Write an enzyme that holds these catalytic residues in place. Structure first.
Site, short mmCIF file in Angstrom:
data_model
loop_
_atom_site.label_atom_id
_atom_site.label_comp_id
_atom_site.label_asym_id
_atom_site.label_seq_id
_atom_site.Cartn_x
_atom_site.Cartn_y
_atom_site.Cartn_z
N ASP A 116 -1.86 15.21 -34.50
CA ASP A 116 -2.28 15.90 -33.29
C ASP A 116 -1.28 17.00 -32.95
OD1 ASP A 116 -3.64 16.40 -30.73
OD2 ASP A 116 -2.08 15.15 -29.81
N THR A 123 -1.10 18.82 -29.42
CA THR A 123 -0.61 18.76 -28.05
C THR A 123 0.03 17.42 -27.74
OG1 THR A 123 -2.32 20.33 -27.35
CG2 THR A 123 -1.24 19.03 -25.64
N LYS A 142 -4.51 43.33 -19.07
CA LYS A 142 -3.73 42.62 -20.07
C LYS A 142 -4.67 41.80 -20.94
CE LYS A 142 -2.28 38.06 -18.36
NZ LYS A 142 -3.02 37.76 -17.10
N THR A 149 -6.69 19.03 -33.89
CA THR A 149 -6.41 19.16 -32.47
C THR A 149 -7.70 19.41 -31.70
OG1 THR A 149 -5.05 20.30 -30.81
CG2 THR A 149 -5.99 21.65 -32.59
N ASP A 169 -7.58 21.32 -29.00
CA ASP A 169 -7.29 22.55 -28.28
C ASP A 169 -7.96 23.74 -28.95
OD1 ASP A 169 -6.26 24.08 -26.25
OD2 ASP A 169 -4.19 23.39 -26.51
N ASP A 204 -0.70 11.06 -29.78
CA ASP A 204 -0.07 10.63 -28.53
C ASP A 204 -1.05 10.39 -27.39
OD1 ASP A 204 -0.51 13.53 -27.94
OD2 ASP A 204 0.72 13.07 -26.18
N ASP A 247 -6.79 10.41 -29.70
CA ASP A 247 -6.34 10.12 -31.06
C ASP A 247 -6.43 8.64 -31.41
OD1 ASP A 247 -5.54 12.88 -31.55
OD2 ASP A 247 -3.85 12.47 -30.22
#
Ligand SMILES: CCCCCCCC/C=C\CCCCCCCC(=O)OC[C@H](COP(=O)(O)OCC[N+](C)(C)C)OC(=O)CCCCCCC/C=C\CCCCCCCC
Ligand SMILES: CCCCCCCC/C=C\CCCCCCCC(=O)OC[C@H](COP(=O)(O)OCC[N+](C)(C)C)OC(=O)CCCCCCC/C=C\CCCCCCCC
Ligand SMILES: CCCCCCCC/C=C\CCCCCCCC(=O)OC[C@H](COP(=O)(O)OCC[N+](C)(C)C)OC(=O)CCCCCCC/C=C\CCCCCCCC
Ligand SMILES: CCCCCCCC/C=C\CCCCCCCC(=O)OC[C@H](COP(=O)(O)OCC[N+](C)(C)C)OC(=O)CCCCCCC/C=C\CCCCCCCC
Ligand SMILES: CCCCCCCCCCCCCCCCCC(=O)OC[C@H](COP(=O)(O)OC[C@H](N)C(=O)O)OC(=O)CCCCCCCCCCCCCCCCC
Ligand SMILES: CC(C)CCC[C@@H](C)[C@H]1CC[C@H]2[C@@H]3CC=C4C[C@@H](O)CC[C@]4(C)[C@H]3CC[C@]12C
Ligand code: ALF
Ligand SMILES: [Mg+2]
EC number: 7.6.2.1
Length: 997
Positions: free
Chosen positions: A359, A361, A521, A630, A632, A738, A742
């Site tokens: 993983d 994150t 931006k 992941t 993310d 973590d 997972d």
């Protein structure tokens, strides 16, 4: 238990229910009280190795198939059974004990008489629970009321889906407008919710208030939900519970705990069938020697029973006590402190891992982002040059009452402090109030809150540099200067960030000078054509991104008091349209995004954990393939892969595009095949299509890749990738994580390692091994995993050799000596009783090492030898088998030749020559000598000489203590051991091992 149905949940009243709901408890246990004994007994006796000893004992009840005493078949079986049950019971109790920390957390519950305290396990569906700031959500809830006046809250969901972004949630409109929190109990409202499912990012529901004269119905979505396992970031919230226990979204994405068996144990089990098969072949052939003589079956089982010690009970015992020593060493290693062994029966699987799936994150990153680099084109600033940016900012405002590089730094810092969506938040420290620190702008009470942690890190840097953001509303921003003057700005137009545009903009008006500035931006890909001509933006962005930084491009455009009017009077026109609003509004914004003045490039880094880069390099040099799965987004995952050096600096990366059908997936799989030494980055949405149609094609292409990165992966997709790697390659896999997302892939993998999270412990509670840091993985594999695998292989193959040498000896004795006699069976057991004086020295093989712990860490290439299966194979087994036959024949035939006088004088030389031979064989096998190995070999010699003295006086056996007895025993041992004592010496010269150099 049953088909899930929609439920109507009334606010309060956890009694107006139709079905019965499960307890809000989290369980990681394999068995309950009722299923404990059947489960433990079946998981043991379903293997041929353990079932073999049970069938031997059960055969003794038949009087015609009875041989020997009845306590010699059950006492060893009872001791072995009394260790499996105690070992399994200890594991379950501590799993229950460790599950009490999460289940006993105390929350608050709104009752008709006031707030009372409730435990997590006692929360029921329909309860109104209060969750405070930085607290975990105990069950699935609907956001009802918040204490803040902004009417919303932020949620951290990194332990539920692995995403670093904060989620903004809003309460139900009716419940938020009520004057008092207790007013939720005096209204007749219910929530209609869909049946429990696995989807984490989708919810369908309805809120209905019957009391109001006009009935009110609201549609609910994921924006109104607070799933269990998330953390409230701001203020205290009130919610109503919908799902508890096994119907939680986190729990529904988790599989049931299972009992795992190691690959080493599956190979010892296979050797016992070969040993039993050889014994049966001998029995069947031996009965053909007589051409069958009636009741031939009574002789085969009798022969099988008499030679049943070809599979010793000491193989089970030695392996069981060996694994106890390995888990003791791991739990006490001070160089990887905090390691907990939960599955203490598979420590040898740590030494044969081929694929490591990790993983991102919380496992590789600290979940903390920091500003690192500022680039102005002609000069770059880093963490060691930030003391000069503060001087440029101070110089301008110290000269305000009292171009150049000071005016180029100030223009860039002021842009970063304004182009964002971060709102300051003040809270009562205890002496100062939230209504007082807001007026005086105290710094200790201020917290920055936003959906993007990158924006918070940018605003935190400008404060440390001199320009602080002290206040923000929907139409105003306030900045504090080094000279403590407050600058007021008016927000005129704000264009929020979307993942399609990949850029953000804002229009502000300075209330001191009256000027209007447009700030934008975004990523370098979209902002390259927006800014004016330059020669450094594209070059320096690539250098910045190659360091693992997240790069943003900041631009400016000064608007007059006439161009804004031509825009404001035209921007509103597109808004008040009923046909194609999205494209109508967009065409007016991109009419302002041309010829912008480039200001700076900003780099933000997500901080890695300690020693992440060296650990990944060590695992890669050991022949272990590492994949990053992941939940993310793609952009953040790619930055971490480059920062952690999962992909090399010179490596090429292929980004899998969004495929939606079978045809699009085939085109993109052919495109990737045409690349060479390329890392694969693929999203979960594209992965679902590829695995549906081209599961074999995709899997073969990804296994030749240097690295594979899977982003936005659902918990079931992670477990699916682990399962396909095991089926398509036939090699062991390891999963490190973590968070609660997972757990599914840790349970599926052959070796599950859980890292203890900062705001959750679900992955650590469900893993075979739990570590506190990612850097502890290297020593757990190259030292503890390698030693356990090497010690088990040597210890198991010596017990088999010892039992095979005795069987060979008692087969020469049974034929070449008498061919039939009753006193033979007395000597048949005396020879088998020789394993008492080698009980301790052979077990001291768990103390052996080939290299030192500082050498296995420095040379990871020693680990690739174990990946080939060298410690235990068919070559090593065959060599051990041939030595056993040679040594057993030499001892027995040398006993019948050197002194063929009497039976007592023959079991005196062979029993002595076998103890010395086995003691000398242990000393040959040992590579590194320990001081306990010395006392073990010398104490066994003592108790044998002592046992040859006590019986010497009682039994008239003076034949032992002479000189004739000395040379015959010495000669036999020399002929047995020395030929195998010279081949090892020759092996070192001709074929040295890599660990010896
Ligand atoms: C055998 C089963 O094999 P399978 O081929 O079906 O594979 C099973 C295949 N699966 C795992 C794939 C589905 O395993 C079995 O039988 C099931 C386990 C049976 C366990 C019985 C334990 C009895 C032991 C009693 C000792 C307790 C003390 C007694 C003292 C008595 C003194 C006189
Ligand atoms: C020379 C070398 C080549 C060989 C040449 C030919 C020789 C032919 C002779 C023997 C070979 C066949 C037998 C081999 C041994 C059995 C192998 C077997 O296929 O095993 C079947 C299963 C064990 O499967 P597993 O553990 O591999 O599965 C693990 C995976 N999982 C558990 C999830 C399913 O179930 C079992 O163990 C039951 C196995 C059968 C029962 C145990 C036999 C020994 C015990 C007693 C013998 C008789 C003593 C007296 C008994 C009197 C009773 C009244
Ligand atoms: C004879 C009966 C043997 C019973 C063995 C089962 C309990 C083993 C044990 O004793 O439980 C593991 C301890 C706990 O260690 P801890 O929680 O004090 O460490 C902080 O680890 C140790 O002592 C070393 C023993 C680890 C072996 C666990 C079972 C492996 C099979
Ligand atoms: C005395 C007469 C004869 C014995 C002769 C010696 C025979 C072999 C004994 C082996 C032994 O005694 O191994 C003791 C083990 C490990 O000790 P170590 O010296 O390898 O130190 C480990 C630290 N390192 C690796 C840095 C050195 O300690 C353990 O397993 C503690 C396990 C405790 C389990 C208690 C019951 C649990 C239920
Ligand atoms: C009903 C519930 C009962 C619960 C337990 C109750 C206990 C009661 C005790 C009663 C008195 C003792 C009885 C012992 C019975 C076994 C005797 C024995 O030593 O057998 C030795 C066995 C071979 O035996 P056999 O007679 O040739 O054949 C048996 C039978 N005819 C058959 O073939 O079927 O050859 C072997 O196979 C060896 C067996 C032992 C293996 C030990 C290996 C070493 C272990 C590790 C030792 C070192 C540990 C170090 C720890 C740390 C120290 C610091
Ligand atoms: C035959 C059996 C019973 C006994 C074997 C010899 C005995 C006395 C044992 C006890 C101590 C042992 C020694 C302990 C230390 C070392 C240093 C090592 O670098 C080489 C082996 C060596 C030299 C061992 C050889 C075997 C040894 C000498
Ligand atoms: F921490 Al993750 F997917 F990277 F759960
Ligand atoms: Mg995580």
């Amino acid at each position: 238990g049953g088909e899930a149905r929609p439920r109507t949940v009334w606010l309060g009243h956890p009694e107006k229910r139709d079905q019965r709901y499960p307890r809000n408890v989290i369980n990681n246990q394999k068995y309950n009280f009722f299923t404990f004994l059947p489960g433990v007994l079946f998981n043991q006796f379903k293997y041929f190795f353990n079932l073999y000893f049970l069938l031997l004992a059960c055969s003794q009840f038949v009087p015609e198939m009875r041989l020997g005493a009845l306590y010699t078949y059950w006492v060893p079986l009872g001791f072995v059974l009394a260790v499996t049950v105690i070992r399994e019971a200890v594991e379950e109790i501590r799993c229950y004990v460790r599950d009490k920390e999460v289940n006993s957390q105390v929350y608050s519950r709104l009752t008709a008489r006031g707030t009372v305290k409730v435990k997590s396990s006692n929360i029921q569906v329909g309860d109104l629970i209060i969750v405070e700031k930085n607290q975990r959500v105990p069950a699935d809830m609907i956001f009802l009321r918040t204490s803040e006046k902004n009417g919303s809250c932020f949620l951290r969901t990194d332990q539920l889906d692995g995403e670093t972004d904060w989620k903004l949630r809003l309460p139900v409109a009716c419940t938020q407008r009520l004057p008092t929190a207790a007013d939720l109990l005096q209204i007749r409202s219910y929530v209609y919710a869909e049946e429990p499912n696995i989807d984490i990012h989708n919810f369908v529901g309805t809120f209905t208030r019957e009391d109001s004269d006009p009935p009110i119905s609201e549609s609910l979505s994921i924006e109104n939900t607070l799933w269990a396992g998330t953390v409230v970031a701001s203020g205290t919230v009130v919610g109503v519970v919908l799902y508890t226990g096994r119907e939680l979204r986190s729990v529904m994405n988790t599989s049931n705990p299972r009992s795992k068996i190691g690959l080493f144990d599956l190979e010892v089990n296979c050797l016992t069938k070969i040993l039993f098969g050889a014994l049966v072949v001998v029995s069947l052939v031996m009965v053909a020697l007589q051409h069958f003589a009636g009741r031939w079956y009574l002789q085969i089982i009798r022969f099988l029973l008499l030679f049943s010690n070809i599979i010793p009970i000491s193989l089970r015992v030695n392996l069981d006590m060996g694994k106890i020593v390995y888990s003791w060493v791991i739990r006490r290693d001070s160089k990887i402190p905090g390691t907990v062994v939960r599955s203490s029966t598979i420590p040898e699987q740590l030494g044969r891992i081929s694929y490591l799936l990790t993983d991102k994150t919380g496992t590789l990153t600290q979940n903390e982002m920091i500003f690192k680099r500022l680039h102005l084109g002609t000069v770059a600033y880093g963490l060691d040059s930030m003391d000069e940016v503060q001087s440029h900012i101070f110089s301008i405002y110290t000269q305000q009452s009292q171009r150049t590089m000071s005016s180029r730094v100030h223009e860039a810092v002021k842009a970063i402090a304004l182009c964002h969506n971060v709102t300051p938040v003040y809270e009562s420290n205890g002496v100062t109030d939230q209504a007082e620190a807001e007026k005086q702008y105290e710094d200790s009470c201020r917290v920055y809150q936003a959906s993007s942690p990158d924006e918070v890190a940018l605003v935190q840097w400008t404060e440390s540099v001199g320009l602080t953001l002290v206040g923000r509303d929907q139409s105003s921003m306030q900045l504090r200067t080094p000279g403590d003057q407050i600058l007021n700005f008016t927000i005129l137009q704000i264009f929020p960030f979307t993942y399609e545009s990949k850029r953000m903009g804002i229009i502000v008006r300075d209330e001191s000078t009256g000027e209007i500035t447009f700030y934008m931006k975004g990523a370098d890909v979209v902002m390259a054509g927006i800014v004016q001509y330059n020669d450094w933006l594209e070059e320096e962005c690539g250098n910045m991104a190659r360091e693992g930084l997240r790069v943003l491009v900041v631009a400016k455009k000064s608007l007059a008091e006439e161009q804004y009017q031509d825009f404001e009077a035209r921007y509103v026109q597109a808004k008040l349209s009923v046909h194609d609003r999205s494209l109508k509004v967009a065409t007016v914004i991109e009419s302002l995004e041309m010829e912008m003045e480039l200001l700076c490039l900003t780099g933000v880094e997500d901080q890695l954990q300690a020693d992440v880069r060296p650990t990944l390099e060590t695992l890669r040099n050991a022949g272990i393939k590492v994949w990053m799965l992941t939940g993310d987004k793609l952009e953040t995952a790619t930055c971490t892969a480059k920062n952690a050096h999962l992909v090399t600096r010179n490596q090429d990366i292929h980004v899998f595009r969004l495929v939606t059908n079978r045809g699009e997936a085939h085109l993109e799989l052919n495109a990737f095949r045409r690349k060479h030494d390329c890392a694969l980055v693929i999203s979960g949405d594209s992965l679902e299509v590829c695995l549906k149609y081209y599961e074999y094609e995709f899997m073969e292409l990804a296994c030749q890749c240097p690295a594979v990165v899977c982003c936005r992966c659902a918990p079931t997709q992670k477990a699916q990738i682990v399962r396909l790697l095991q089926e398509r390659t036939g090699k062991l896999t390891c999963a490190v994580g973590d968070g609660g997302n997972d757990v599914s892939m840790i349970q599926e993998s052959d070796c599950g390692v859980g890292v203890e999270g900062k705001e959750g412990k679900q992955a650590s509670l469900a893993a075979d091994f739990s570590i506190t840091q990612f850097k502890h993985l290297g020593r757990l594999l190259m030292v503890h995993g390698r030693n356990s695998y090497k010690r088990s292989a040597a210890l198991s193959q010596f017990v088999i050799h010892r039992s095979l040498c005795i069987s060979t000896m008692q087969a020469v004795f049974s034929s070449v000596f008498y061919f039939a006699s009753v006193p033979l069976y007395q000597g048949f057991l005396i020879i088998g009783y020789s394993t008492i004086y080698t009980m301790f020295p052979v077990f001291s093989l768990v103390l052996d090492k080939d290299v030192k712990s500082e050498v296995a860490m420095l040379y990871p290439e020693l680990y690739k030898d174990l990946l080939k299966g060298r410690p235990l194979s068919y070559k090593t087994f065959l060599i051990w088998v041939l030595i056993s036959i040679y040594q057993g024949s030499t001892i027995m035939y040398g006993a019948l030749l050197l002194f063929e006088s009497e039976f007592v004088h023959i079991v005196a030389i062979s029993f002595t020559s076998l103890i010395l031979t086995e003691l000398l064989m242990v000393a040959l096998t040992i590579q590194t000598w320990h001081w306990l190995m010395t006392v073990a070999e010398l104490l066994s010699l003592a108790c044998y000489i002592a046992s040859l003295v006590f019986l010497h006086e009682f039994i008239d056996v003076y034949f032992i203590a002479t000189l004739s007895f000395l040379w015959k025993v010495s000669v036999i041992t020399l002929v047995s051991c020395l030929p195998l004592y010279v081949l090892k010496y020759l092996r070192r010269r001709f074929s040295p091992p890599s660990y010896s150099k």
